Amino acid sequence: PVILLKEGTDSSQGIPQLVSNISACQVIAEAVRTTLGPRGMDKLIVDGRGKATISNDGATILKLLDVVHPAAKTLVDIAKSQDAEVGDGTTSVTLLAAEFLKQVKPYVEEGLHPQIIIRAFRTATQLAVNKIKEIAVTVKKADKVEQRKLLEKCAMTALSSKLISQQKAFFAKMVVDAVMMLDDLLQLKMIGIKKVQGGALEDSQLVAGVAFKKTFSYAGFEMQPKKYHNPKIALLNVELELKAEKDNAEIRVHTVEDYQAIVDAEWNILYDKLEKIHHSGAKVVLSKLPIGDVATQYFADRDMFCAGRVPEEDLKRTMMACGGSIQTSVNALSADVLGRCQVFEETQIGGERYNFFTGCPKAKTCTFILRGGAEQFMEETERSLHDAIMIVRRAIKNDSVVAGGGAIEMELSKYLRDYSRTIPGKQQLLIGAYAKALEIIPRQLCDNAGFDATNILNKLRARHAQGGTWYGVDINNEDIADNFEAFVWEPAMVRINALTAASEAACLIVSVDETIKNPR
Amino acid sequence: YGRPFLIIKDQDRKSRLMGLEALKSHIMAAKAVANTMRTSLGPNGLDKMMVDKDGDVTVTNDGATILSMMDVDHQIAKLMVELSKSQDDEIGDGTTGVVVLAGALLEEAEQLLDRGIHPIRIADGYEQAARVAIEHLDKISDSVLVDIKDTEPLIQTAKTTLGSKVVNSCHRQMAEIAVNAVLTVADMERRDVDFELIKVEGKVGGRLEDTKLIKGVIVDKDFSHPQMPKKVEDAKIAILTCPFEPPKPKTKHKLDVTSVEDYKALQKYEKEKFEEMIQQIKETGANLAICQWGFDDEANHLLLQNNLPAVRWVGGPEIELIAIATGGRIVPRFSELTAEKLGFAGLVQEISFGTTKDKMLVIEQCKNSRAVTIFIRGGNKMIIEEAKRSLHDALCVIRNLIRDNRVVYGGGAAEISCALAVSQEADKCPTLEQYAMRAFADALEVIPMALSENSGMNPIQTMTEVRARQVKEMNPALGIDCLHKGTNDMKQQHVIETLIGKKQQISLATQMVRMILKIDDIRKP
Amino acid sequence: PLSVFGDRSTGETIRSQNVMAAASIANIVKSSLGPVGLDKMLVDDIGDVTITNDGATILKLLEVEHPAAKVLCELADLQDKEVGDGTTSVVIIAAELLKNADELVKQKIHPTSVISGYRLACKEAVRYINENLIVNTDELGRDCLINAAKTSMSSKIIGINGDFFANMVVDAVLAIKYTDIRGQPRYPVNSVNILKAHGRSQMESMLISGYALNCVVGSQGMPKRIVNAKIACLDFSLQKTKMKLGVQVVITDPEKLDQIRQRESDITKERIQKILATGANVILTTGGIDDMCLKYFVEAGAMAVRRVLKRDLKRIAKASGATILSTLANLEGEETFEAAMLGQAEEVVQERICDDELILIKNTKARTSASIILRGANDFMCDEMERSLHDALCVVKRVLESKSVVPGGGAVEAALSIYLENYATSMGSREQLAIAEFARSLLVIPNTLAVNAAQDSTDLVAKLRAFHNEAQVNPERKNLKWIGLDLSNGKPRDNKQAGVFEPTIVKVKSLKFATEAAITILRIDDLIKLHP
């Protein structure tokens, strides 16, 4: 007899497969459970090459987990989606999905239809989205100072549970000034993040221009002054070295006369190109192609600066900061294709030579200098800076903040309970469990902070039922206070997106009752 | 019904350690590292012998290189090595003290973890105590005068910072050489120096007393012809880049010979070009030409007959070094040479050594030079390496002094004063944060205790005596007498240390402690 | 640190493992709960098949290597050894209580308060069970034992044919009742002969009024039908006489060896003649009988059965009023046999039942015995029928000893849950959630009963809860507490007049054992395993 499928196929039923999926989801969520509030701790992941990865964000932890389970990949997908969308609540959506799954596990084991559960999840998500959009309460016409203060408060709230929580009052203004100088398209590729070893965390500065690392140098780099008052930057893209004209060329020289003529003509062409480059009135020469030793020595005899091997992103940032253009040919070097700045220095920071370009008022970009650790600390600082920049960019386009902590979750749970207390039938238990699952955020916060969770949750529920709406948890006073009055704001695009992602993950996980695995 | 499934690809071959066990293991590893790097601190500390993988022996005293050459496997040890490397790259001196301070701060925090204190509160208290110490240390900062005339404070600081390595016999000589090199390459208009202009060359033979500097550029080559004059009095340096070969383009060229006239013309031009270039070189009136590439056969004979010495195989940084020292300009071809693109020399004499055939050419007696070279002499390679490391440390110390133009009172008084200020400020902070400030103050007193233990005296007794003498009078400068001079005052002993360096060390140690107190998990295959 | 040389676990790792083990143990035996669940099948490594669904046998034949599961296994074994019924329900209740207490432990709650609340809830449930009691001797009496036996035999292989089996069990219990101090009605079990022989079906398995023996006759010349015979109980070997080890024989006169050899065989003949001098017919011997001794019984027209068990001989002597004599010695120095200690049977007929034969003994004049010969198909059906008969006998004995019956089903658990929910409002301390968890853990029996029936579980649970809440308050509707649960259609009915009948000693003991197991397991949070 011949078997149906290939030898090595595994299959299961529906109830055990769903139980295994719930167990896998709970095990996955238990790993990124302690990382939430400011009192949470980060993890340390080591791969096979021996490199450590210390990051407080749950996205990197889920990416470095390397999970081959066919059902546990739903959390990583929604986490990546949330990180690419707003880039903030990466673990909140996973915690909410795990809580919903743990709440529906007894209902599934008791014998309930999954379609009814999916419909209840969709209805609860729609009701929560409607409630959030209704209690949004955004400003209609505010001044620039109010918007700046709101952005600073949002940045301080986003940088409160990271590693730079002690210096949240310094990076807020920096990220505000960085986002405000990004025109309207909001280009993230025009923000350079440099990591130089040495210094302290408070020694970080933000320049209003461009700054890159010093590339290769020849024997004519120390015979030139690295300081100019009002120079001119000329953006080029041609190679300045003694080489052949074309690779597919052949010269059939006759006697010594034509040989000497060609030898003289090569140097004549080189000198003509050098004179055409110098006659543009510039002082700083930048090009992507490496510069030879002849041009480096020629530019040093006229008090001119030159630098080769310039990256494409650095050149684009310098062009956007100054206002020039990429000129490949040297036959059209006017005055509108050159840069302009007010000051140009070349200091040594951390034992490495760096070039500074600032002073131009028409700058549309900036450069960040992150100091502190060596590798892991710098990566964590860069991740926190990117998260704060994304939060500010989202708050600029949304201009509608809400109370943080756990007041919105308590309000949504109370609304869901009040809605379920009216409709009878089996629709009440599902909405009740959905509302009770939303109360795990303050409990998790109290567990991470090491405080009493039961009494705090009971007091919050009593205050929400006796109402006195934006009331969350407090870690300093170890009690409850007003989150809206404590300058604790968060964008509204993080809660709705996380709720939708959790609902989609639940609908995709519950609607699965079979798992077929093929050999090899 | 939960059967053991599979989540991670290597779940069966991976370990998991959560809770306080990982933090306790990290604290134990930090304490072990601090105890291993404890004897190499102070003037009475001994050196360490490192064994390379291939079989090389390297004996040094700098903690940075010791920690770097240890290829360990723990994450905490690697983090400490990276911290020491960053400290050495930022400041340069005091690489074995920051690790000891971090270990002492992490050791005192182990009691608070067992008593019942949250690590976030401990980190906040440590940061507050570090900020208080930083704000208090700038009040007892005395500014000293630094210029070209008076060089006594710089020499005193360079001698105080060089009292633990094996290069302590000269002391005053090495400090004078370092301060002279710094005054030569100072650049006061921008408040920064450049290490690319100061070249350090070490060779076997000689002694430590023969480490006299040379105001010029030294090379490791000689003349292309043995029948050339070795020493000259009045010579004009002419640095060139084009070789002594006939011109040839870099493109694809092919010469065709048809009749005998073309071959005769080529044979004539082969020597005509050499004669023309020789006449062009001689027309400028130079006395010592320098080429980038090598010479052939006829060019060397022509230069010897025309009485014109030259140097072969010198196309590296020596060209720019000579152009900066003498003042000449590099030329691309032979036509542009008769102008003002020459360098004036003073003494170009080829020195010799022992029985070996090692000949080195040196150039001295120049004008306003901006680059000097140091010739290291010793009896072993490890001695030369230690001398170079000590010279680099002294240069970094003098650079920090130039950048800061102010010093304090080091030894064993600044840490005690900071601990006393922290303990005094902790009495007015009744909000559970007084426990971390006491630990931070007790961890800062690990430097005088270690100094007294390495010297051979009672640590706790001397520390208590110094604390009582400082709290009884108003002189925050009484340290630990490690040289047994009878006077505990560091002001009379010319004990000068850096302020910004100590501040950066304290800040980096506090940041490392805060980062370590935040990690509590580990996942390794 | 800590040189232990062994795997250890501290924290929520051992607790989660114990919870998973308890859940797996509960789910393993969750397919044979109630009259709706089917049976199981256990096969070894050589090919022997074992079909059972009692609960204790499944946990005994499963090779358990985990201590958390070994505790549940030994608890089920002790429960089956004590009462005899309710081996899986107690394990399910304990597993549900453990799963409910795990959620409270994970909620930053001290286990001491949870244990105290569980103990208080168990005490309240025990005190509330004595309130809902129905006296079996105050109603009909005869119609209640039949219903109890039918309920006990409703989840076995004889679920349909339970009307005749219940009457047979009742008759066997009434005939097996012993007489002692005449103060309390004692009904001892394990006294009937349960013979398993294939051949006929289930309706042809009648009840034999008397004791049955699983032995055949000795010699072929002995009769197989003796009316009005005398049963003789012996406890000694009836073979040739042999001297002891310390007594040797040194032949010194050839004129006496033949006499000694003749006396060695004549002693046994004289003993047999003295034993059969009172006119004995039925002779039962535990040891072996020689071939020379059988000739006397053949020529005398009597029966001699050998290789008789001690328990069977004791039961025969107790039923017939005889006395097992280990020797022929009396108060003097001569071996004499009297007729005052002899049996008096009615008729002994050795009937052939499927190839093999067996000796049947009817009732005598002293006491009355009983024996049930169950007939199945192969060997597993006979074992299942024997297990069901033993369970029914144990249930009937417990009912007759408790003198009370409680309507089983999904009513007692719901009533206890409602009473615990109404009692949590008085306890204003930290034990309010423990009582709620204890009440919610008792509602897992109706959920499993509805899941096994493939019907609506949530709607039935809500209807039962509403009915119990309406029956609790308002004294005008106090007759709605006997609703039970009807799994044949999925609607409440009358579980008191003619529904489910169960004793009250099974629920209280099982609940107490489950609470004790949950308490003794919840206090574990550190596992240390040494290397062999």
Ligand SMILES: Nc1ncnc2c1ncn2[C@@H]1O[C@H](COP(=O)(O)OP(=O)(O)O)[C@@H](O)[C@H]1O
């Ligand atoms: N200063 C604060 N006050 C109150 N709540 C805060 C504060 N900082 C963070 N939180 C809360 O901690 C939670 C975690 O936020 P965060 O760590 O920034 O991202 P994630 O939600 O991805 O962990 C948020 O839901 C927020 O409500």
Ligand SMILES: Nc1ncnc2c1ncn2[C@@H]1O[C@H](COP(=O)(O)OP(=O)(O)O)[C@@H](O)[C@H]1O
């Ligand atoms: N002559 C001295 N008098 C007092 N203190 C000294 C003396 N020499 C060294 N020290 C102390 O010993 C410590 C270690 O110095 P050293 O080993 O020379 O360099 P490093 O500080 O880089 O370890 C310094 O902090 C200094 O205060």
Ligand SMILES: Nc1ncnc2c1ncn2[C@@H]1O[C@H](COP(=O)(O)OP(=O)(O)O)[C@@H](O)[C@H]1O
């Ligand atoms: N005929 C019946 N009608 C309703 N419920 C029943 C019936 N027979 C048994 N049950 C219920 O099924 C449950 C399981 O009993 P059973 O499967 O016989 O083994 P155990 O009593 O050992 O659990 C009992 O609690 C009883 O209430």
Ligand SMILES: [Mg+2]
């Ligand atoms: Mg976030």
Ligand SMILES: [Mg+2]
């Ligand atoms: Mg030093």
Ligand SMILES: [Mg+2]
């Ligand atoms: Mg039963």
